[PDB]
Amino acid sequence: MRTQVGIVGAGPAGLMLAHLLRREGIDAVVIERAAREHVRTRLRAGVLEQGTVEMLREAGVGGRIDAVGMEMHAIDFRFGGRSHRLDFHEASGGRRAWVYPQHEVVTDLMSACDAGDVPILYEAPVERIEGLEDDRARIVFGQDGAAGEITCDFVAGCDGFRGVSRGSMPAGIARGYDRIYPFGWLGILADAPPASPDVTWGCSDRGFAMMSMRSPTVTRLYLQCEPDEDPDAWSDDRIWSELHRRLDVEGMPSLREGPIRDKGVTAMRSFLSEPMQHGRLFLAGDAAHIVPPTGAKGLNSAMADIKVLAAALVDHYRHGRSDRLATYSERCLRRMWLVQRFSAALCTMVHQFPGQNEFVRRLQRADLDYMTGTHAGRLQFAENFTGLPIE
Amino acid sequence: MRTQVGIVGAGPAGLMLAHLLRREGIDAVVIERAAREHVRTRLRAGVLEQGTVEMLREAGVGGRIDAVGMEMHAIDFRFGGRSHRLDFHEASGGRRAWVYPQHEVVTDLMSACDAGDVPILYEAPVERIEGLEDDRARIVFGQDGAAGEITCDFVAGCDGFRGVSRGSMPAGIARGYDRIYPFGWLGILADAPPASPDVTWGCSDRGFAMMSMRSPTVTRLYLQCEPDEDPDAWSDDRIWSELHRRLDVEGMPSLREGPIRDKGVTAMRSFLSEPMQHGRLFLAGDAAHIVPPTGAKGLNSAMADIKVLAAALVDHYRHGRSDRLATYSERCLRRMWLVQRFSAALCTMVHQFPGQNEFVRRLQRADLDYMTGTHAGRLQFAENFTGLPIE
Ligand SMILES: Cc1cc2nc3c(=O)[nH]c(=O)nc-3n(C[C@H](O)[C@H](O)[C@H](O)COP(=O)(O)OP(=O)(O)OC[C@H]3O[C@@H](n4cnc5c(N)ncnc54)[C@H](O)[C@@H]3O)c2cc1C
Ligand SMILES: Cc1cc2nc3c(=O)[nH]c(=O)nc-3n(C[C@H](O)[C@H](O)[C@H](O)COP(=O)(O)OP(=O)(O)OC[C@H]3O[C@@H](n4cnc5c(N)ncnc54)[C@H](O)[C@@H]3O)c2cc1C
Ligand SMILES: [Ca+2]
Ligand SMILES: [Ca+2]
């Protein structure tokens, strides 16, 4: 059970890496703790940066984006009882974002991995990653009750925030930067058409809310809630009540209601670990970093990490240039710290912080006024939201 | 004992107002608790926004700015061991700031008020402001141990953060927004030439420092220190030691030392009160709001308030219309919240916060990288630093 690149985790980062390597003739094996069906149908991300769309297209997995996706040009910020449509397409000088949800991406990537005969082991939790400075690393997993081992030149830690790979970094080398925000998000899908054509952010003093969309007939909505909230405490009526209160404004169509499903609570957390590599182990995606999702940056950052990592592995195996592996972490971190900055700035501006200093609270409205109401503020939002360059 | 506008405080705001009113034939009396030369020589502001410079020139009190002022085009941000010269003249579309210190402004304004026979009462602490909704307001003061009272149509509260006018606002009307930062500034003047032509900000992990200037032979320096710090704990050697450590970088000239004077510790605080008027009382300047001084905004904001207040009083007395007095507070507050935002943003970025969450601390460097290293970041800094528009 030997390969060139062992990939822990068959989420979007791991599948994209396997596919990119396969296209370049580099052998990989993916090892995934969950059932394949469970992985595919996780509902998380909705929105892709333009750089991500280009990357999916260029890797041959973007064919359904035009028909299934929805191109986005503006965010409608609701606050002070008014709509503030920020055209980030214009402000960024023509760059866009797309609704194209994570489960579609993962479906596309699993399809591409299967057609390339990429071996993926499911229901195969990795328990240990060994030999990071040995001549080859060892991935120790269990499957069907029995212990297995993958030996490989490099291990890609693509196993998300609660994976094993980040804790496989030697702790004398790793440094964590971690901030948990004092709220979560209650998220739902609703069989109800979007009330307006733009993704809409309710920056209310009851709390944050969002109306995003999946199709002309399905909306994806979020409500700021208590940290560790019990979804059972939110009847459908309570959910629509807070959504209306936080989003609706005079002169814009009222939010449309419909049957709710996929109700769940997620955390709001900024986390980054340095370095993103050590010896034969390279961390990518949520294993290396997470952000609060207001700015639609996590899957996009994972894809940026994998773009760098795949290219670096190709340079090492095909072109006799191992220096790009050596600078993987340095390059991914420069981008990731700016993404962290932007995701934090959105998070601290649009959510209500319980018991917050009143001056700091009133600056939230100043920040919203400035961001939506000035050329410079709109520019910064637009260039960041549609996706920073990748090195 | 009867006048048209009674002005509490002969700082820059009060003297500017008295002078602007004098030029329009509106009678004012200024009542000041301290001695004249004490007020004149307070060591505070050094830097003026372009708008403030234009205001002084238009008022006939700007003739010395060219002679003893110093036009500024850039801030040199020192961090990560490197110099980062942000040309805000270029990034603001040609606007500037000037070194022209507060004591020179006040000297100019005192001279102009004296030449105009504006009565100014020194060593005359105002005790109470009464009759805000009576047919005329009453300013009760003491001077030479005798009680006095000035009756007026309007009271301009220009008596600074620790004055009496803010507390004369009915407390059921007023709302404060207050945030103290966990550090102060130790400030000095040094008879030492500036080591480089630009005001230089030391954004170091030891704490903030600044090298500003007054002349080719006099520098104005600040060090972040503990809140409520004792200047006695800072020998000259300790002062220069920390200034060198926080400012000097390789490849730029080293800070020059010279004899030190006017050592003092000042607070770092964001405060705003709403509204800025009630009945016949109008607050202006530090009486109404303070900011942490990193961005050189307090005197400039005081002058913005006075520009609006004087024009409103002139419209009321001289063009017969009183709608502009009615909107004084609404207009000054819109500008002032954006000033608060900017001053707060600089303050939280360039000072070390003891025991801060490490993720938030590391965002300080991201904020510095983005501000200095992107067009959008430079634009926003430059437009704000050189001074926002006044309504
Ligand atoms: C509510 C919400 C909304 C979001 N919206 C957006 C958005 O609009 N845009 C965007 O760009 N991002 C968004 N994100 C972030 C995005 O979903 C994540 O950043 C993304 O899932 C990261 O992918 P990944 O492959 O790095 O990790 P994951 O998707 O978490 O995949 C990791 C995989 O590793 C597997 N694994 C775990 N432990 C082991 C183990 N021991 N052995 C083997 N396998 C293991 C897991 O089963 C999982 O399949 C959102 C997130 C949330 C919560
Ligand atoms: C270290 C430092 C650096 C600064 N740098 C800058 C800068 O570069 N640029 C900038 O724009 N701003 C700067 N500022 C801010 C600026 O100094 C203040 O905002 C400015 O002094 C405000 O002027 P004012 O007239 O509103 O109040 P003040 O200057 O405080 O004057 C109010 C007057 O009222 C008097 N008074 C008080 N109580 C009474 C009473 N009961 N009766 C009568 N009179 C009374 C006081 O004696 C005083 O003379 C700085 C401040 C500090 C501390
Ligand atoms: Ca109801
Ligand atoms: Ca009366």
Residue numbers in the entry:
A (entry chain B), B (entry chain A): 1 to 391
Task: Recite the paper's sentences.
To understand the substrate recognition mechanism of XaPobA, we determined the PCA-bound structure (XaPobA + PCA) at a resolution of 1.65 Å by growing crystals under imidazole-free conditions and soaking them with PCA. The β-sheets 14 to 16 in the substrate binding domain were located significantly closer to the catalytic center in XaPobA + PCA compared with XaPobA + imidazole, indicating that bound PCA induced XaPobA to adopt a closed conformation. The PCA molecule in the active site was adjacent to the isoalloxazine ring of FAD with the aromatic C5 atom to be hydroxylated facing the ring. The carboxy group of PCA in the XaPobA + PCA structure hydrogen-bonded with the side chain hydroxy groups of Ser212 and Tyr222. The side chain of Arg214 had two alternative conformations, one of which formed a salt bridge with the carboxy group of PCA. In addition to PCA in the active site, we also identified the electron density of an apparently catalytically inert second PCA molecule located near the ribityl moiety of FAD at ∼6 Å from the isoalloxazine ring. The Corey-Pauling-Koltun (CPK) model of the XaPobA + PCA structure showed that the side chains of eight amino acid residues formed a hydrophobic cavity with the aromatic ring of PCA. This was buried with the 3-hydroxy group of PCA enclosed by the Met72, Ile75, Val199, and Trp201 residues and faced the bottom of the cavity. The carbonyl group in the main chain of Thr294 formed a hydrogen bond with the 4-hydroxyl group of PCA and was the only hydrophilic interaction in the cavity. The side chains of Val47 and Ala296 formed a cavity wall parallel to the aromatic ring of PCA, and it was sandwiched between another cavity wall formed by Met210 at the opposite plane of the aromatic ring.
Para-hydroxybenzoate hydroxylase (PHBH) is a group A flavoprotein monooxygenase that hydroxylates p-hydroxybenzoate to protocatechuate (PCA). Among proteins in this clade, Xylophilus ampelinus PobA (XaPobA) preferred PCA as a substrate and is the first known natural PCA 5-hydroxylase (PCAH). The overall structure of XaPobA comprised a homodimer, with each unit binding an oxidized form of FAD in its active site. The XaPobA monomer consisted of FAD-(amino acids 1–73, 88–198, and 267–391)- and substrate (amino acids 74–87 and 199–266)- binding domains.
